[PDB]
Design a protein around this ligand. Structure first.
Ligand SMILES: *C(=O)CCCCCCCCCCCCC
Ligand SMILES: [Ca+2]
Ligand SMILES: [Ca+2]
Length: 188
């Protein structure tokens, strides 16, 4: 006797501006389908990787799947809600519109220090390697067949010296430069 939404729909669509949601009618039935996986209401971090197994049953994005969590599930919560979930899930795609793209400096900044360093870059770098398949690992330049050998390619592309800490401000431009950059540190 009442129109249901799923505890979320008007708060998210509010984002209609940044990035064009696949379809306002998408995150609608997607809310219940989740309630079925568990009559709960909070997604854990250990089970977060249990999902990536649907869109990538090939490689083992299990190492990079745990990084996308603290990426935005640190908002003083401890659990990922469906609202913030659609944001990240659709961010890894939904094409490239205006603004946005800022959520990227969030997944790469694991610790979250307003600035990225070689360490964090190393973790996400090695993890991303797992997602890559050996059969395809032969395509990338051998000058970086290992996480320790590539850190020089990525960090070398940007070019840090005095302020050896990449900020979220440039993290967006340093990439807007050569469209062939985001291809390396690419994420899915
Ligand atoms: C109020 O009268 C009860 C809630 C009515 C909800 C309307 C939708 C009912 C149909 C749900 C199943 C539809 C499957 C396509
Ligand atoms: Ca959260
Ligand atoms: Ca940091």
């Amino acid at each position: 006797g009442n129109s249901k939404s799923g505890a979320l729909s008007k708060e998210i669509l509010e984002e209609l501006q940044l990035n064009t949601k696949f379809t306002e009618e998408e995150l609608s039935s997607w809310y219940q389908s989740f309630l079925k996986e568990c009559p709960s209401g909070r997604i854990t971090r250990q089970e977060f990787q249990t999902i990536y197994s649907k869109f990538f049953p090939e490689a083992d994005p299990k190492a990079y799947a745990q990084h996308v969590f603290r990426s935005f599930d640190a908002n003083s919560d401890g659990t990922l809600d469906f609202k913030e979930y659609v944001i990240a899930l659709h961010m890894t795609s939904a094409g490239k519109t205006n603004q946005k793209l800022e959520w990227a400096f969030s997944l790469y900044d694991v610790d979250g220090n307003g600035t990225i360093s070689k360490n964090e870059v190393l973790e996400i770098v090695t993890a991303i390697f797992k997602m890559i398949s050996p059969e395809d690992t032969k395509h990338l330049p051998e000058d970086e067949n290992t996480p320790e050998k590539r850190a020089e390619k990525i960090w070398g592309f940007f070019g840090k010296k005095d302020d050896d800490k990449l900020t979220e401000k440039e993290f967006i431009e340093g990439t807007l430069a050569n469209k062939e950059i985001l291809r390396l540190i690419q994420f899915e």
